[PDB]
Amino acid sequence: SDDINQKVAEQLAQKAQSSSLGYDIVESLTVEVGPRLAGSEQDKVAVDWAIAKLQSLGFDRVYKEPVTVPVWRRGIAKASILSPFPQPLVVTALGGSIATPAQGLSATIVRFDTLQDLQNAEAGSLNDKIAFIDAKTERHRDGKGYGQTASGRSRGAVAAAEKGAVGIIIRSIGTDHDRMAHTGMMRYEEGVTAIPAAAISNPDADLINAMLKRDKEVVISLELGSERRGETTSYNVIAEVKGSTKADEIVLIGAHLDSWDEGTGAIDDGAGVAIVTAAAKHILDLPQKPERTIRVVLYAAEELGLLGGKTYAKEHEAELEKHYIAAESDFGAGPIYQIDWRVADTAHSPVINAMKVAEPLGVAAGNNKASGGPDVSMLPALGVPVASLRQDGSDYFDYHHTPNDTLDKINPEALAQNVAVYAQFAWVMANSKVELRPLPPK
Amino acid sequence: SDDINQKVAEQLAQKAQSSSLGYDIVESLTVEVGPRLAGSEQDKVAVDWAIAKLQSLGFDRVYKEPVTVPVWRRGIAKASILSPFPQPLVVTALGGSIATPAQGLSATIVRFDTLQDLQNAEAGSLNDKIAFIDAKTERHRDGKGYGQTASGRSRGAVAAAEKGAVGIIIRSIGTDHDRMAHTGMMRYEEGVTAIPAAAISNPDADLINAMLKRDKEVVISLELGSERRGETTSYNVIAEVKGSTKADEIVLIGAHLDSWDEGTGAIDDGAGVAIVTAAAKHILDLPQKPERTIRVVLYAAEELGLLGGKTYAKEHEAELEKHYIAAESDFGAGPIYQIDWRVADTAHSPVINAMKVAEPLGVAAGNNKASGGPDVSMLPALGVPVASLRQDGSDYFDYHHTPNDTLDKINPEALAQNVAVYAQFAWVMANSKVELRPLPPK
Ligand SMILES: [Zn+2]
Ligand SMILES: [Zn+2]
Numbered sequence: 001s002d003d004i005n006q007k008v009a010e011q012l013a014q015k016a017q018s019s020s021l022g023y024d025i026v027e028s029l030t031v032e033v034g035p036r037l038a039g040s041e042q043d044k045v046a047v048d049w050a051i052a053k054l055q056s057l058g059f060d061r062v063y064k065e066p067v068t069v070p071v072w073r074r075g076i077a078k079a080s081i082l083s084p085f086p087q088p089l090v091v092t093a094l095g096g097s098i099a100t101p102a103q104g105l106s107a108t109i110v111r112f113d114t115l116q117d118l119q120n121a122e123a124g125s126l127n128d129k130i131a132f133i134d135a136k137t138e139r140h141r142d143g144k145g146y147g148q149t150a151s152g153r154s155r156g157a158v159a160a161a162e163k164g165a166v167g168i169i170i171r172s173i174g175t176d177h178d179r180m181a182h183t184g185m186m187r188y189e190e191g192v193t194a195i196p197a198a199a200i201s202n203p204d205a206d207l208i209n210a211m212l213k214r215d216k217e218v219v220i221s222l223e224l225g226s227e228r229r230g231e232t233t234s235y236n237v238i239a240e241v242k243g244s245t246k247a248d249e250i251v252l253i254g255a256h257l258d259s260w261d262e263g264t265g266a267i268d269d270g271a272g273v274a275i276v277t278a279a280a281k282h283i284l285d286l287p288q289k290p291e292r293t294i295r296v297v298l299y300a301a302e303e304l305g306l307l308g309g310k311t312y313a314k315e316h317e318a319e320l321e322k323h324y325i326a327a328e329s330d331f332g333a334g335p336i337y338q339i340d341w342r343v344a345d346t347a348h349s350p351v352i353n354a355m356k357v358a359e360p361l362g363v364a365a366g367n368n369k370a371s372g373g374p375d376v377s378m379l380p381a382l383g384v385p386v387a388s389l390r391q392d393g394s395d396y397f398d399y400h401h402t403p404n405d406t407l408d409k410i411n412p413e414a415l416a417q418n419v420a421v422y423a424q425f426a427w428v429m430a431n432s433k434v435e436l437r438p439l440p441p442k
Numbered sequence: 443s444d445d446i447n448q449k450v451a452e453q454l455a456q457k458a459q460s461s462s463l464g465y466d467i468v469e470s471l472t473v474e475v476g477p478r479l480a481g482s483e484q485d486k487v488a489v490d491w492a493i494a495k496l497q498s499l500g501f502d503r504v505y506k507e508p509v510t511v512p513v514w515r516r517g518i519a520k521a522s523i524l525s526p527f528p529q530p531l532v533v534t535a536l537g538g539s540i541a542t543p544a545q546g547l548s549a550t551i552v553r554f555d556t557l558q559d560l561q562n563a564e565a566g567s568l569n570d571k572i573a574f575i576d577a578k579t580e581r582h583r584d585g586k587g588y589g590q591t592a593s594g595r596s597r598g599a600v601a602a603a604e605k606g607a608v609g610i611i612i613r614s615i616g617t618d619h620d621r622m623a624h625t626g627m628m629r630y631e632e633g634v635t636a637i638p639a640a641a642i643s644n645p646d647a648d649l650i651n652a653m654l655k656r657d658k659e660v661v662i663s664l665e666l667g668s669e670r671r672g673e674t675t676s677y678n679v680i681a682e683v684k685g686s687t688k689a690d691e692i693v694l695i696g697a698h699l700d701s702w703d704e705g706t707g708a709i710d711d712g713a714g715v716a717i718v719t720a721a722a723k724h725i726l727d728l729p730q731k732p733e734r735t736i737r738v739v740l741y742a743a744e745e746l747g748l749l750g751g752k753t754y755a756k757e758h759e760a761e762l763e764k765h766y767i768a769a770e771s772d773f774g775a776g777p778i779y780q781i782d783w784r785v786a787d788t789a790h791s792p793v794i795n796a797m798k799v800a801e802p803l804g805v806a807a808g809n810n811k812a813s814g815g816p817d818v819s820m821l822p823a824l825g826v827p828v829a830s831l832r833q834d835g836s837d838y839f840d841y842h843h844t845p846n847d848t849l850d851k852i853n854p855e856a857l858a859q860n861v862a863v864y865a866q867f868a869w870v871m872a873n874s875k876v877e878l879r880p881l882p883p884k
């Protein structure tokens with residue numbers, strides 16, 4: 001009954017709070033693998049680590065599924081201001097950037113408040129120059145500031161090249177004022193000349209601004225080494241807690257296994273790997289079996305455009321109708337404060353009620369318009385219900401995509417609360433009688 | 443009278459709180475010069491900046507005095523763990539390190555809790571190996587943690603070479619857990635083979651520890667580029683507020699103009715330059731003249747061993763008897779909470795009383811055993827009284843000697859409180875009738 005399962009969920013939360021497992025999994029990943037950019041030598045290391053780890057935890061099935069991934073290698077990154085006042089910058093290439101010319105790159109910059117301002121510039125206005133997008137990212141619990149500025153990183157190099165720019169630097173898409181350059185994916189556009197593209201630290205962007213405010217033009221030097229290889233194979237890594245009376249139905253709880261390459265991928269998304277794996281292990285430890293199968297999916301190549309998520313959706317196309325609900329942890333280790341849903345209108349109040357078991361952990365009732373996390377975000381359009389278990393990310397963009405994304409950034413008590421809430425979610429959902437389909441129109 | 447001068451001191455503090463001058467001076471230095479390692483091209487840039495700045499503020503005399511300085515240039519710094527689990531490290535050369543061999547340097551490490559533990563190792567025990575000193579620096583308002591661990595940086599390369607080491611890495615002498623490597627001076631010893639010497643970030647030292655805790659040996663790669671040139675000339679930069687009835691007597695308020703090269707030297711010691719310069723300017727702005735001359739000294743090459751301070755003490759030897767008191771701001775921008783003295787026994791209670799004017803700014807009475815700041819610390823032995831105006835440095839070693847020592851680390855309200863307290867100090871001391879000599883035995 002709902003009552004019996006509420007009490008199991010209460011006990012799962014107790015276990016999460018008394019067990020070092022969640023922390024131990026992320027310590028293991030960050031120490032024994034470290035950064036694991038898709039397509040790098042560390043990609044296979046992370047996959048092999050995850051397979052061994054899941055086997056060692058005793059899951060009923062542990063297997064992997066191939067995902068095609070591109071190969072990009074980061075080389076040197078050096079930048080400085082040449083004039084008016086010569087100074088060093090702390091820079092990093094945007095993910096996928098081409099290298100700077102062998103002859104080298106030195107140019108006058110032109111500052112834009114935002115990507116939109118750059119897109120509005122006159123054609124030819126950046127000939128021989130480097131674009132500088134200065135947009136600052138606001139700090140928000142829900143990360144909505146990142147949502148407003150991230151496109152500068154994703155699309156700035158295209159917009160700048162369209163105006164004649166020979167390069168782009170951006171203010172890091174970060175909420176810190178640390179001397180850390182934030183990387184992340186960017187995309188060139190077929191038809192537009194690819195140009196070198198880098199992020200500079202927030203203090204460096206402040207410095208450039210201080211010089212511009214003196215009615216001086218700023219000239220920089222930028223050097224980026226990088227290399228592109230042909231595509232290869234990574235893997236979605238999967239573990240299951242075997243179901244019982246409804247074993248053909250799947251509750252999917254996910255994270256991504258890949259990361260950027262300059263930190264150790266601790267909060268993005270080693271924390272999420274640990275949260276969903278530990279939650280599933282606590283469930284595996286129960287004397288009771290869930291009705292549904294619980295499937296942990298550790299997705300490949302999320303950083304490169306949800307490639308593993310998209311691959312999974314297609315590979316499991318015939319199985320999606322039997323996916324009861326899907327959710328993903330990929331907003332660091334901050335505690336969960338709300339669960340939002342994407343279920344049938346007639347399921348919404350029932351699932352809110354089911355998850356009131358998490359109220360004492362600080363988790364509020366939510367809406368019925370959830371997108372789901374990145375790797376499951378394509379699944380509602382295919383009919384699959386999802387939940388967004390909302391994490392407090394107020395500090396997340398201080399470290400996201402920097403060399404500072406390290407184990408010591410994880411608050412163990414907060415990590416444990418996520419393990420507790422996912423364990424409750426996966427248990428309650430794997431035993432729920434609520435009909436979650438059909439999803440109402442978006 | 444003491445009463446009239448108490449009220450001027452109160453008004454000076456008002457000015458400091460209502461004026462952006464202190465902040466503006468450090469903004470100017472960090473933007474228009476940036477990092478200014480002694481002996482680098484930026485050394486002359488900083489001197490020329492300071493001369494122009496002091497002239498622009500209208501000081502009665504502005505001049506400079508030569509200081510011999512060594513020339514060391516930092517090149518590349520790359521390090522990684524090769525085994526058991528290959529990963530990147532964030533490293534920086536210790537100031538003055540020789541370069542690593544052209545053939546390259548890869549070696550097994552041996553961990554030591556502290557410099558003392560390394561010094562206790564058996565001769566030959568580090569043959570072919572790299573020493574790793576792991577001592578963590580405790581956070582303290584007075585910086586006493588730095589005092590306990592700093593010698594690992596200063597003297598570790600010598601102690602490691604004595605035991606056969608081919609190199610040394612240290613846990614950065616820092617209180618942060620940021621991915622920032624802290625540099626700073628080290629000294630080789632004539633007679634002992636010079637070896638490459640670097641600091642790694644605190645998270646990287648944690649990582650190495652996590653591998654060692656797995657009963658694995660750790661092997662690293664270390665690459666350091668550096669170059670030593672012959673000595674050259676830097677300068678102590680001096681400004682004066684002209685005295686009146688006691689113009690032959692000097693109240694010296696100082697800071698150092700030089701910095702390490704990877705940040706912008708904002709808190710070490712751009713803040714101190716701004717504090718003492720702004721304090722003197724507020725005094726210069728008064729309609730009243732001080733009795734004594736107030737001398738702002740912006741010392742050269744403090745980071746390389748107090749070279750400008752030592753030079754000043756010798757150059758001004760015949761003038762020291764007329765130095766009434768000396769003090770230096772070189773503990774960032776945190777507010778002052780206490781003034782300690784080094785005056786005659788019979789002057790102690792009188793100077794405490796004189797400075798009770800700063801109580802409302804949060805400044806407590808202090809002792810009579812002050813060392814004085816670094817550049818004036820040699821002066822008591824020459825008979826010159828000093829004060830230590832104690833700053834709250836709880837956060838100072840998060841940024842000291844890192845690339846993160848940037849303008850945005852300065853709390854403007856705290857910087858203003860220092861300007862207020864130095865203005866009071868310099869005014870009260872430049873008009874005091876207390877006999878400060880002779881100093882009692884140390
Ligand atoms: Zn992520
Ligand atoms: Zn990411």
Ligand SMILES: [Zn+2]
Nearest residue numbers: 698710711772
């Ligand atoms: Zn200093």
Ligand SMILES: [Zn+2]
Nearest residue numbers: 702710745843
């Ligand atoms: Zn220093």
